[PDB]
């Protein structure tokens, strides 16, 4: 064998000439670049999340998460309700700066369960909740003969073959 292939049609390993050894070929790191921003009104300071990539390679504050690494946002330990979705349980603005923290799933409370105790409401609140549901979209109509072939006969004759 001279070179190896993955399950898909991509090369995973090669037999290096000049030494007769096996070298694993890994597609060199690449990823999307996302920008954490609290909003132009809130602050012009932003953080850069490099997606699905290590950042030992390209630097003021670096936090590595399963979604890649965040640069420009400091990692805090105390959790908060998610303000910006980052991924892998991580969310990101506080104290005039962008902070990164594990998401808080909510206020942890334990109900006082007892085999002979029941909690019964002595009062009530009548609340009103707004639920917005789209029922229709714009009734857009596009004519093919006008759209792809503008005011010309010969393009229409070519279209009729299609």
């Amino acid at each position: 064998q001279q070179f190896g292939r993955d399950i898909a049609d991509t090369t995973d390993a090669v037999r290096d000439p000049q030494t007769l050894e096996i070298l694993d070929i890994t597609p060199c790191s690449f990823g999307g670049v996302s920008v954490i921003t609290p909003g132009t009104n809130t602050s012009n300071q932003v953080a850069v999340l490099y997606q699905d990539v290590n950042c030992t390679e390209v630097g003021s504050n670096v936090f590595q998460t399963r979604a890649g690494c965040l640069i420009g946002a400091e990692h805090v330990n105390n959790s908060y309700e998610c303000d910006i979705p980052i991924g892998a349980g991580i969310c990101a603005v506080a104290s005039q700066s962008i902070i990164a923290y594990t998401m808080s799933l909510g206020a942890e409370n334990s109900v006082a369960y007892s085999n002979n105790s029941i909690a019964i409401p002595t009062n009530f609140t009548i609340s009103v909740t707004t639920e917005i549901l789209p029922v229709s979209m714009t009734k857009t109509s596009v004519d093919c003969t006008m759209y792809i072939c503008g005011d010309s006969t010969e393009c229409s004759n070519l279209l009729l073959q299609y």
């Binding site: 690449f30 990823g31 670049v33 954490i36 132009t40």
Partner: protein, 48 residues
């Protein structure tokens, strides 16, 4: 360079954003808005 120019009602260019200046400018260019709301925005692809 790629530039996002804000034309007023009279056609005068009142503001501009350089897409290559900083990540916030790139975010403004990708959203085609001078003001960006709170949230994550994918603007480019880092490729080594």
């Amino acid at each position: 360079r790629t530039f996002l120019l804000k034309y007023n009602e009279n056609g005068t260019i009142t503001d501009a954003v350089d897409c290559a200046l900083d990540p916030l400018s790139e975010t403004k260019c990708t959203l085609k808005s001078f003001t960006v709301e709170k949230g994550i925005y994918q603007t480019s692809n880092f490729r080594v």
